[PDB]
DNA sequence: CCTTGGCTGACGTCAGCCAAG
DNA sequence: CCTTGGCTGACGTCAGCCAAG
């Protein structure tokens, strides 16, 4: 009927949830991931540069 | 009254719509400032370990 | 070159929670 | 402590889109 179209696009709905979901949390990640990277190179560039032309 | 409510109510699901979005903007977003700050200082890290130590 | 149907924004409503009155 | 406001989640509906025949 209209009423199984209707259960059908329930039902998805539920589904097309889920998703943003994970894709905010997934973004979510991420970020701190690279929060960590970014944070690690920066200590690395500067010990790096903490022994300049030699010392 | 159960209108008035629903009404104000109503209003808060929009503006509250509103701030998820832009916030799965704004990780969209930061999260390829990272990934840019990123390349960057690997490169500037590529470039002084070979120039380091005098080649 | 049309029909479909899946997918997904956007809405408004119902719940519960957590300040702040 | 109330209780009562606001905010937020999860939910169903409805509308429009673009692939896949
Ligand atoms: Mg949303």
Chains 1, 2 share one sequence.
Do not use: F, G, P, W
């Amino acid at each position: 009927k209209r009423e199984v179209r209707l259960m059908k696009n329930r039902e998805a709905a539920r589904e097309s949830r889920r998703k943003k979901k994970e894709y905010v949390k997934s973004l979510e990640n991420r970020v701190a991931v690279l929060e960590n990277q970014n944070k690690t190179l920066i200590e690395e560039l500067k010990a790096l540069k903490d022994l300049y032309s030699h010392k």
